[PDB]
């Protein structure tokens, strides 16, 4: 459930948060619209796990594995079992054109996987999430997390991310000024963002929120992409360009740091990243 | 409205939030359960005003002025007009045993004041907010802000505070360790908090949230106070002790810094306070 009567937390023993000590002084930990930016050191996972377990929270995870990308599923799912929402109810939704190529992955208790067959041809994920699966998701999960498959979990990804709407800071651009962001810059596209606008550059590979907010986002992005197609224009970074436009105009209620979407081959392991949680696999 | 369909923000020009620059490095700006702590420099009020105006947000402000405390109403209300939620819809609810002693204060457009008569005898405010005014508030406002009257506004107090549930850091204790907090320490009281528990010491003089969450808090505190009365025990700091117990067990979704409740006579003007927003008046 979301937003239902919340019972009292039990007694807990943990370090006192000290008002005149920030943990993190090296990074921005709250946006100018008062959304937390989730970095290691900003959250006590024991408190958050209590809060979300007391709501019997169910998290849906969507992933698309079409054509050759079915090869990424084994590592993706096996590492999700080690690191993604462990202790909570999880429902994986694997969208594929090859149901027989989905690996048989052993799941922990309280976790389930559904294989959903789709047609083969990145930009049509918005349609599938919003048009075909709307009723399914509303009936089955509280939150949806939507990710790329060519990835692996290396460290904790848990309920600290959950909120009505979140995006993830793109690992390539978190230190960049907005003029350098690769937003869509042609006014003829629905994804257009002028050089004097923009908070962050969010990566299309990891977003989520409540089912209602994720359906709103994916519907809006799908509609905007259809308008662009009718006008003979394709945004520079496809669904990611539209996601960025949406999150500019509809501020996320949490922002995930690049701990949550990293490429170590391309970008190494900077001091500001205390953990690499969810990382690109080659190809 | 709260939680209803949110239209797109318009184009806005403002400084880019920079990920590798925190504004505030001198204070904790997010709790360990990922609630913002509201300090000057952490929010862009233009973004927040847009978000809340697009919901046509109405804020109720409750204040009690019983017996000699009617004398505080003129300054309280006149300064609220200068500083409290200016531009938003406001409904003041003034609870008094002397309706004729309520000063005639001129209000800005979109703002209204209701005088509610009560009996004369600090601890029964929880009952009035939760038992007598439940239906009224649900029909009339989106958020409730509940404050002491022996106060004045000196600077902006606006929609940055609004959230499902908030408390305010007590100005006397924000730098203190939890063992020094003046929580109720007798196990025989419903307000009891052991020396190894506690996040913050919240002041009873400024709390709020959505109408639903404020009714939950005030009902719980009223019930706990009734249990203590039946057991012949009175908590050390009365309603404030119970508020603290509630907010330990039900984490607030924002915490206000002591900018929002200050006593300059007793505590001066420390460097960590960039603004003194809402301050004690003598007596
Ligand atoms: O033949 C394909 C191609 C894509 N995918 C799916 O689509 C995702 C995105 O494609 P990918 O090749 O991973 O794109 P990237 O270049 O790694 O990522 C960029 O492109 C994506 C799609 O626009 C965005 O999600 C990312 O944010 C952006 O960095 C994949 O992970 C799969 O889940 C398939 O299943 N089969
Ligand atoms: O004769 C009275 C006494 C109290 N009040 C109301 O009750 C409030 C609280 O009383 P006050 O005298 O202001 O208490 P303080 O000692 O200033 O404040 C402490 O006591 C309050 C009541 O327990 C808590 O709200 C505060 O957090 C705590 O710091 C007042 O502001 C009024 O709104 C009256 O209207 N008439
Ligand atoms: C400045 C240096 C940027 C380095 C990262 C660029 O990443 C690419 O960014 C694009 C938007 O400009 C778009 O999101 C694709 C993205 O490339 C993907 O993500 C990278 C982090 C790598 O994993 C890459 O192989 C992948 O294709
Ligand atoms: C350590 C020094 C603390 C100094 C402030 C003490 O304030 C008092 O704290 C009590 C809880 O311990 C309770 O909230 C009453 C509170 O006193 C009220 O608030 C102060 C800030 C003053 O305005 C005071 O006059 C008022 O009675
Ligand atoms: Mn990818
Ligand atoms: Mn007072």
Swiss-Prot record, chains A, B:
> What cofactors are annotated for this protein?
Mn(2+)
| Recorded consequence of changing residue 151 to R | In allele Bel01; loss of manganese binding and reduced catalytic activity
The residues that hold Mn(2+) are 148, 150
Binding positions for an alpha-L-fucosyl-(1->2)-beta-D-galactosyl derivative per the UniProt entry: 170, 182, 240, 263
What's the reported outcome of changing residue 119 to G? In allele Aw08 and allele Bw08
Outcome of swapping residue 228 to N = In allele B104
Residues that hold UDP-N-acetyl-alpha-D-galactosamine according to the record: 64-66, 69, 148-150
Q: Where in the cell is it found?
A: Golgi apparatus, Golgi stack membrane; Secreted
Positions annotated with a glycan in the UniProt record: 56
Provide the primary localization: Golgi
Please name the catalytic residues of this protein: 240 (nucleophile)
Q: Which reaction does it catalyse?
A: an alpha-L-fucosyl-(1->2)-beta-D-galactosyl derivative + UDP-N-acetyl-alpha-D-galactosamine = an N-acetyl-alpha-D-galactosaminyl-(1->3)-[alpha-L-fucosyl-(1->2)]-beta-D-galactosyl derivative + UDP + H(+); an alpha-L-fucosyl-(1->2)-beta-D-galactosyl derivative + UDP-alpha-D-galactose = an alpha-D-galactosyl-(1->3)-[alpha-L-fucosyl-(1->2)]-beta-D-galactosyl derivative + UDP + H(+)
What are the record keywords, sorted?
Blood group antigen, Glycoprotein, Glycosyltransferase, Golgi apparatus, Manganese, Membrane, Metal-binding, Secreted, Signal-anchor, Transferase, Transmembrane, Transmembrane helix
Q: Name one GO molecular function term.
A: glycoprotein-fucosylgalactoside alpha-N-acetylgalactosaminyltransferase activity
* PTM annotation: The soluble form derives from the membrane form by proteolytic processing.
Q: What is known of its domains?
A: The conserved DXD motif is involved in cofactor binding. The manganese ion interacts with the beta-phosphate group of UDP and may also have a role in catalysis.
UniProt family annotation: Belongs to the glycosyltransferase 6 family.
Q: What is this protein called?
A: Histo-blood group ABO system transferase
Source organism: Homo sapiens
Which gene holds the coding sequence for this protein? ABO
Q: Which residues of the full protein are shown?
A: 64 to 346 of 354
